[PDB]
Design a protein around this ligand. Structure first.
Ligand code: NAG
Length: 220
């Protein structure tokens, strides 16, 4: 029910990462949600290998630096029966042959769940579960240049999303608020982008940028 949530303060979230020049955001969104649920489970925050996902999760539907889905990622961790740590399987920003090594697994998952397409459900799910993997229309130059404040983009689509990110919670602006409410969104473009890597994004403004059209998370 909370009028504010920040999972970064409860220890759920790793420091901002950078996918570099590789369409692997689906993989940073996925590890982000898996890092969170692994923490809820064990009380241990261990950073997870995106390269593992990029290299190995093709059989689940993912296409490396050419793109992918978070759901596919969670499916691979299940099928595979583990995922390697960031330390053991470092990120390289390019597609290589699979080097997974069951000895270095530090996370598991058991399925995933998809939140229905409602900023109400997505409010619930943040509050209940953990950080949530979501997809957004990021394909505007205002998103490139974003520095601070609450992101709103008139030409944003709620149906055509192109970029996976992580909702680590939500707030509001103005000691009150209809307005101005924001989602708290961790990106994977390095800390130099946005607000040290994060972005506040319009919440309950008609599913802005489709932040709720494709939400999900891993069961553990
Ligand atoms: C993941 O789960 C499988 C089967 O439940 C188990 O064999 C494996 O040891 C687990 N790995 C970790 C790192 O928890």
């Amino acid at each position: 029910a909370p009028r504010s949530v920040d999972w970064r303060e409860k220890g759920y979230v790793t420091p901002v990462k950078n996918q570099g020049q590789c369409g692997s955001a689906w993989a940073f969104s996925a590890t982000g949600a898996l890092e969170g649920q692994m923490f809820r489970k064990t009380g241990r925050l261990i950073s997870l290998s995106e390269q593992n996902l990029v290299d190995c999760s093709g059989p689940q539907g993912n296409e490396g630096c050419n793109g992918g889905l978070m759901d596919y990622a969670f499916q691979y961790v299940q099928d595979n029966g583990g995922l390697d740590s960031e330390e053991s399987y470092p990120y390289e920003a390019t597609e290589e042959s699979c080097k997974y090594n069951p000895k270095y697994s530090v996370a598991n998952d058991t399925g995933f769940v998809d939140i229905p397409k409602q900023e109400k459900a997505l409010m619930k799910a943040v509050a209940t579960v953990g950080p949530i993997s979501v997809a957004i229309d990021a394909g505007h130059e205002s998103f490139l240049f974003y520095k601070e404040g609450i992101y709103f983009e008139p030409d944003c689509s709620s149906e055509d999303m192109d970029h996976g990110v992580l909702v680590v919670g939500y707030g509001f602006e103005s000691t009150e608020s209809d307005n101005n409410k924001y989602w708290l969104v961790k990106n994977s473009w390095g800390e130099e982008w946005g607000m040290g890597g994060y972005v506040k994004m319009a919440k309950d403004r008609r599913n802005h940028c489709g932040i709720a059209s494709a939400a999900s998370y891993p069961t553990v």
